[PDB]
Amino acid sequence: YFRVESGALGPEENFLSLDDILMSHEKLPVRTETAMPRLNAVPQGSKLELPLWLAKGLFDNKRRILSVELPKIYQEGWRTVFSADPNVVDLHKMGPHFYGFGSQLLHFDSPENADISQSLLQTFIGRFRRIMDSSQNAYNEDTSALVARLDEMERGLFQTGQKGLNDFQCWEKGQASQITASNLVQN
Amino acid sequence: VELREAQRDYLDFLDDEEDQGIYQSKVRELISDNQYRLIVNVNDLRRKNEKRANRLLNNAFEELVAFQRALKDFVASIDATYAKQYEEFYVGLEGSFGSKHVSPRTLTSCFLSCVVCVEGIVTKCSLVRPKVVRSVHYCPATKKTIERRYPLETEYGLSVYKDHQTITIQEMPEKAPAGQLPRSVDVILDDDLVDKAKPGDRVQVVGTYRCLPGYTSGTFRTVLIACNVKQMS
Amino acid sequence: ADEGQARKSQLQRRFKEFLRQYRVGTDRTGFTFKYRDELKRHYNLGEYWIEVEMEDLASFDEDLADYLYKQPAEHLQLLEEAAKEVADEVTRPRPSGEEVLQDIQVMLKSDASPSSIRSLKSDMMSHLVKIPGIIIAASAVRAKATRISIQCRSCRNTLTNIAMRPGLEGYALPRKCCPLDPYFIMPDKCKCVDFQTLKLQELPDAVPHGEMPRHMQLYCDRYLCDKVVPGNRVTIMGIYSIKGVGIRSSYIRVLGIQVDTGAVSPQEEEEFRRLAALPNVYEVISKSIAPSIFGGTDMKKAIACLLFGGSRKRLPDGLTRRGDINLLMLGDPGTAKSQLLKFVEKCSPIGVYTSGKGSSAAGLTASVMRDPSSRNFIMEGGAMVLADGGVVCIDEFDKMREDDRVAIHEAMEQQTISIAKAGITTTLNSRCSVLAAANSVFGRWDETKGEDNIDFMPTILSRFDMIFIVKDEHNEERDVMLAKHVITLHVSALTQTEIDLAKLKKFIAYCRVKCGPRLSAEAAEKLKNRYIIMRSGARQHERDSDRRSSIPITVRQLEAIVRIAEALSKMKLQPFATEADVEEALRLFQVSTLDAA
Amino acid sequence: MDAAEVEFLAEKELVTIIPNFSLDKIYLIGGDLGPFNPGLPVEVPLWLAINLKQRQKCRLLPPEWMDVEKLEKMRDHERKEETFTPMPSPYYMELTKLLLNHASDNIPKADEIRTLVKDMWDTRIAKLRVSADSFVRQQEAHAKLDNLTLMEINTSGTFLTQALNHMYKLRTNLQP
Amino acid sequence: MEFSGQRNASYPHCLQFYLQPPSENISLIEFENLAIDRVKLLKSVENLGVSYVKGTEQYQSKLESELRKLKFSYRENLEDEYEPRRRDHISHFILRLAYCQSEELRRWFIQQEMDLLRFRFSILPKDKIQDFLKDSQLQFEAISDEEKTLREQEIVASSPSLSGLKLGFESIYKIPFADALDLFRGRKVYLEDGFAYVPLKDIVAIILNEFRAKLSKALALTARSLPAVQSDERLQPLLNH
Numbered sequence A: 001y002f003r004v005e006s007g008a009l010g011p012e013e014n015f016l017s018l019d020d021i022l023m024s025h026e027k028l029p030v031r032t033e034t035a036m037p038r039l040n041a042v043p044q045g046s047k048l049e050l051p052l053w054l055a056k057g058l059f060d061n062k063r064r065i066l067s068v069e070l071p072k073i074y075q076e077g078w079r080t081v082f083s084a085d086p087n088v089v090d091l092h093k094m095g096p097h098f099y100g101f102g103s104q105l106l107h108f109d110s111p112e113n114a115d116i117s118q119s120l121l122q123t124f125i126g127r128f129r130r131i132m133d134s135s136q137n138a139y140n141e142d143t144s145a146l147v148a149r150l151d152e153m154e155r156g157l158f159q160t161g162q163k164g165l166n167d168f169q170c171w172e173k174g175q176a177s178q179i180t181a182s183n184l185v186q187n
Numbered sequence B: 001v002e003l004r005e006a007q008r009d010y011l012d013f014l015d016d017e018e019d020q021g022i023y024q025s026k027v028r029e030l031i032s033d034n035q036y037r038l039i040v041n042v043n044d045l046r047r048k049n050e051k052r053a054n055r056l057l058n059n060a061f062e063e064l065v066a067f068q069r070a071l072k073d074f075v076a077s078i079d080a081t082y083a084k085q086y087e088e089f090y091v092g093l094e095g096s097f098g099s100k101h102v103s104p105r106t107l108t109s110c111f112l113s114c115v116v117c118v119e120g121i122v123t124k125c126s127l128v129r130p131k132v133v134r135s136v137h138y139c140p141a142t143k144k145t146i147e148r149r150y151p152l153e154t155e156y157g158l159s160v161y162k163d164h165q166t167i168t169i170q171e172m173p174e175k176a177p178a179g180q181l182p183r184s185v186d187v188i189l190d191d192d193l194v195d196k197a198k199p200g201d202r203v204q205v206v207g208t209y210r211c212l213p214g215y216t217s218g219t220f221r222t223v224l225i226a227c228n229v230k231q232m233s
Numbered sequence C: 001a002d003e004g005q006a007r008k009s010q011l012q013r014r015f016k017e018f019l020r021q022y023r024v025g026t027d028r029t030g031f032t033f034k035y036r037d038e039l040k041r042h043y044n045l046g047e048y049w050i051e052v053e054m055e056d057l058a059s060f061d062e063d064l065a066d067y068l069y070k071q072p073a074e075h076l077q078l079l080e081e082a083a084k085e086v087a088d089e090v091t092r093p094r095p096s097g098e099e100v101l102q103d104i105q106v107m108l109k110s111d112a113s114p115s116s117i118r119s120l121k122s123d124m125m126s127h128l129v130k131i132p133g134i135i136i137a138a139s140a141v142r143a144k145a146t147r148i149s150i151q152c153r154s155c156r157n158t159l160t161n162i163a164m165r166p167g168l169e170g171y172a173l174p175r176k177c178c179p180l181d182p183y184f185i186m187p188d189k190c191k192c193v194d195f196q197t198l199k200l201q202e203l204p205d206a207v208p209h210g211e212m213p214r215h216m217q218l219y220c221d222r223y224l225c226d227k228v229v230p231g232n233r234v235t236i237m238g239i240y241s242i243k244g245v246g247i248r249s250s251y252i253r254v255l256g257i258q259v260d261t262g263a264v265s266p267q268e269e270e271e272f273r274r275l276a277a278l279p280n281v282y283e284v285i286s287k288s289i290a291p292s293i294f295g296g297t298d299m300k301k302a303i304a305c306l307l308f309g310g311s312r313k314r315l316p317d318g319l320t321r322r323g324d325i326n327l328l329m330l331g332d333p334g335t336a337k338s339q340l341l342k343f344v345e346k347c348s349p350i351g352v353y354t355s356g357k358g359s360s361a362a363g364l365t366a367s368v369m370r371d372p373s374s375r376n377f378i379m380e381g382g383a384m385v386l387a388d389g390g391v392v393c394i395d396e397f398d399k400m401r402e403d404d405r406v407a408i409h410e411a412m413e414q415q416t417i418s419i420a421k422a423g424i425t426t427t428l429n430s431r432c433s434v435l436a437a438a439n440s441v442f443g444r445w446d447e448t449k450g451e452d453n454i455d456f457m458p459t460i461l462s463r464f465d466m467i468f469i470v471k472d473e474h475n476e477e478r479d480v481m482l483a484k485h486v487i488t489l490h491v492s493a494l495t496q497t498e499i500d501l502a503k504l505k506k507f508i509a510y511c512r513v514k515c516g517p518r519l520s521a522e523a524a525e526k527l528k529n530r531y532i533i534m535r536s537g538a539r540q541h542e543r544d545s546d547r548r549s550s551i552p553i554t555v556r557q558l559e560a561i562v563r564i565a566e567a568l569s570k571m572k573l574q575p576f577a578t579e580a581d582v583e584e585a586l587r588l589f590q591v592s593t594l595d596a597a
Numbered sequence D: 001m002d003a004a005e006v007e008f009l010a011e012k013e014l015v016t017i018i019p020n021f022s023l024d025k026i027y028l029i030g031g032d033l034g035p036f037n038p039g040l041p042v043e044v045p046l047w048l049a050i051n052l053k054q055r056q057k058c059r060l061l062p063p064e065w066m067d068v069e070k071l072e073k074m075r076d077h078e079r080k081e082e083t084f085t086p087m088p089s090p091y092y093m094e095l096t097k098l099l100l101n102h103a104s105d106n107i108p109k110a111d112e113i114r115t116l117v118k119d120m121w122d123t124r125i126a127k128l129r130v131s132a133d134s135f136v137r138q139q140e141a142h143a144k145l146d147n148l149t150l151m152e153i154n155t156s157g158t159f160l161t162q163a164l165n166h167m168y169k170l171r172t173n174l175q176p
Numbered sequence E: 001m002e003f004s005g006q007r008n009a010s011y012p013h014c015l016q017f018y019l020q021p022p023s024e025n026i027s028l029i030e031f032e033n034l035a036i037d038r039v040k041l042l043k044s045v046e047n048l049g050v051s052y053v054k055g056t057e058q059y060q061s062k063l064e065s066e067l068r069k070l071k072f073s074y075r076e077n078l079e080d081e082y083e084p085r086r087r088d089h090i091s092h093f094i095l096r097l098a099y100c101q102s103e104e105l106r107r108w109f110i111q112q113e114m115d116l117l118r119f120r121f122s123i124l125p126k127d128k129i130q131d132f133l134k135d136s137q138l139q140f141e142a143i144s145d146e147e148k149t150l151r152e153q154e155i156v157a158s159s160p161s162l163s164g165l166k167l168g169f170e171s172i173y174k175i176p177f178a179d180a181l182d183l184f185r186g187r188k189v190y191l192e193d194g195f196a197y198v199p200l201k202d203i204v205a206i207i208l209n210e211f212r213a214k215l216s217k218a219l220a221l222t223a224r225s226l227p228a229v230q231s232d233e234r235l236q237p238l239l240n241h
């Protein structure tokens, strides 16, 4: 089963990826720069919240229809908090695709791009060692306390580490040669 | 003897007139209001010197004394006359502490000597009363005098005292684990911090967690020597 | 002495070999090193403890196990030192910031038979013992020194790294380098650890007739702190030692704790997922509840919904909704009411059972009293506080005084207890279910007298989600069937030699912590249209009558049906409740409260 | 690549057996083997040696590096060095498992040898952990690996390369 | 695993001895103020002297503030103190010419230099002593250190000034009596068979003496060889006033 991968960290989403489809559903705050009829009308200057896909669709580089702003968690007040000790913050109570969504805001040419990139990279480097140690060393135990705070991207790395551990333990204890049934074990 | 270089680090951090001059402005305000304590934001210190900031939080005592001496030298370099009006200066902390933010339940014996940030609800107070730091005696028949720190007769105007008070902080009952009663801790307030909180207040206290001595049973009582006190509503 | 040092060194080597050579398995499959791997994985996670088993050590070398049984204090420290030096070579080299080696705590475990407290002959001083019992008292945590430094008052000489003994005994300082009491402790150089104390009660079935139960004092250290609370039944392993002219006290130093009854293993989750998946789980659970009691299938179904409960909610403007469910049983004598209460107390993960005749208002909610030490006033928790998060069984409910039943009106609805006495004002939590049993005013239900069988006031009858009336019936076929059932139950006490109670207990806890439902839109629409009919009928009955009824229909009943719908959905681990679930919820409420009204 | 496939490669290593029967020279696609004479040694690949041992048709002889005196010196040298030391066989772990499970009856001091080989695995894995962490902290771009074996690579390697892919993507993103 | 991927050589230590000419460029105002600020420093050392006793903590505490204020080299820092070190080096070469105008002025600035050097040598941590003695020509090799405890007994019995603790913390090494010249001719301390059991401060005295000798030779060269460079001398009167 060749699941189509997410594109989010690069310059574009992958068209057929389910994760990018869910992630782009998130809402973003904006200001209306030209009045809109039959939506009755929306006057100029009105403040709104609408999905990321629609915001990218309407944002011509002239900034003729609307102008965009960063959500609170990507502004300086919160970046300062991540900088203290990134291990403690809950990136699942933040948006479930923190890095993926954050990487796509750089599209809108804000003056704060140089700060957002440094925030994301430093957060990742800060969190890495705990993911490594805890995934590689937790054998046949309740992992629910460990995996609780991890972002969707980080969770994939946890699963890969666990899989690698399990295979070696099977081989050492001699279980590796036996033939068995696959996902059709459901039935 | 690296603490002489640590004090040197703090002194050049405080001398920020070469880079937008925020802390020099704050010290000037302190002088104008005749005060003797400063409040430093840990985010600025962490930004300028990662090593010194991350060491301060895990070595509260040995690092804060160096910071106090640096402040004393800096204010003396601004005005020696003002620096002679008070025996010693103090520094308080604010900002984000990350892993050191706790409650009276999660605070345990492994936090001893760390800078900690406790929060809860105030339940009681003792009365303000003086404490002696330096005592003096004098003899008019000989123009002689003696001193001690912590015949002739005592000089109350040449001796000097400071205020002391105790309060108690309790865990938020909404956050108690199932089927248990709330836990609590004792806080010590000293000099210009006395009577800054009263019962029923919700407070957040910054301080250093420390044991008190007590033949010995090898068993101690732990208290939080406050370094700053904050209120919210 | 050098001979003593040589002996210590030799024994330490033997313990080290046990840790780094022991293996399990067969050559037909493959071998694994049991304790090396555990040390590695625990150290890399920041644990610093292991749990050695006496059976294994006894098999590797009998002499070491013998020494560790007869002289535990003298030898256990050699084992702890050995564990430390093995951990180092098993992990080294460590990354930056990790270069300093930490200390390991070693815990003990065994499969052998317990002995009662009464069995402790004083020949057992300092020998290793295993004891069962109940925890009846528990201290708050304190700090205890392991190593210290001291300084002289008059001439400022110092002594440092002074070792302090573990357990409940003290220490004394030197007098040489001066005054008679020349040294004082430096608190900044105290290496301290957590420590706690407990009191143990001998098992109710072990104490003979015509004697008191014995009781014992316990000491607790480092990773063992806040592992238990009072009322729990536990098994303890430790050292037994001492703490008119010749009296001295005695206590036990704990080395391992086992709660006779933890996180669910992956295998257990697969079984619970299977139980949630299979299609007729509701009937399976219904048959597991109180299996000896004949009949009463509807009553057993309602009890199942009580154990799983609805779901807690916090609304946008900050107010709360309670989620959990209250149930009342009322009617004839000899109908097994007390038996069902007695079962639910054992089936629930947390539960308490009390009698209405033998309890007081201050005992049910909370109390204030003076400390036996000091002179200060202190708080105490009643039954409804100890059972926070669980079920409270109130038996003989109709025999409380009026002013005492008034005391629980806050706890049953707002799930909190507000106190203002003796100069203290606080709010405590009580998030628990009430299950109650009662008789008619006339001893058994008298159908000629109607509503006069009930004299509870409306302000408490409206706080129950469901009310059941139970009447005895004299049908011959049921009587013959019941008689045969009872007789074979008695006869099969020897001959005896779907879900078990233990399995069901763990399953309930798992479902409660992981799953929280909500209504589907159409389900809410259906329930809305039903509620209007129900209110209209109740109003017309009161209008037609000359008398107002004791069991009202209010918005609390609308909430009650929603809570039952959520419970039914929770048994199947489904995120949304459906019209099928609302149909069953309405059926259960239709039987009980509308037969009572 | 799974542990099963790494073992499949390890089974090509040659070992010495003493047959208890007689057979002519046999020609295989991979080479010529034999002749086989009773009571006299011959070289064969490990997959064949294990199979004949199970069916009670031969005796195994330990490889010359499987010796307590040799393995002690190797363990000490490995613990002392700051890097990965070269190894007595590229497939030392796999060969140890296969021979000691089937051929304990012919290999003296087997339970000593198990412990000595386990210690080398424990040391080398720790070095790999430190290297991975250092690679990410310093944001490095290339590294060298001259004495790692294929089982040791395969055990931990997938995690590391998966993490490095994402990190390289985060640091470049400001310049499409 | 093994991974793959300029002014340090100029001044590996804050200490410097002016062997190499800085073969580079300067601005007019730059060399002017580099020298003139040090003139203020020379006066300031003796102003501190008239304030209170030489070399005490009061001296130490005030003196480092002068250096931080005046941007010249320090107790040695790990960041770019090489810029203050080369400024110190360059400005030292510039200072050779001002107070060579009279021998009394030469001796005056030499004396405050000796005081400054003695202060710096008083500040030194152990690692500085260990690396500078090996990285400099100032080798002064030690011999047979295990015998120091026989001299812990003998010196203590034989000396009013020295003590057993000074054997270790003013760490003792063996060099001749002549390197402790004032101590043998005053007969102040334990020396035996022509050898002295010596702490660092004697080698500091030798450093100061050879520094004075080399500097005096340089001042003679300053008096003699300089006229080709003297296309501008406008600062010299303002400097000698």
Ligand SMILES: Nc1ncnc2c1ncn2[C@@H]1O[C@H](COP(=O)(O)OP(=O)(O)NP(=O)(O)O)[C@@H](O)[C@H]1O
Pocket (backbone or CB within 6 Å): C292, C293, C294, C295, C332, C333, C334, C335, C336, C337, C338, C339, C340, C486
């Ligand atoms: N259906 C039944 N199955 C088994 N035992 C039953 C049943 N009904 C009644 N009993 C027996 O009834 C006796 C009394 O049980 P109990 O629980 O006190 O009923 P009760 O309704 O609470 N009686 P009361 O306290 O007078 O109101 C016990 O000995 C039970 O075994």
Ligand SMILES: [Mg+2]
Pocket (backbone or CB within 6 Å): C336, C337, C338, C339
């Ligand atoms: Mg009964």
Ligand SMILES: [Zn+2]
Pocket (backbone or CB within 6 Å): C152, C154, C155, C156, C157, C176, C177, C178, C182
């Ligand atoms: Zn003394």
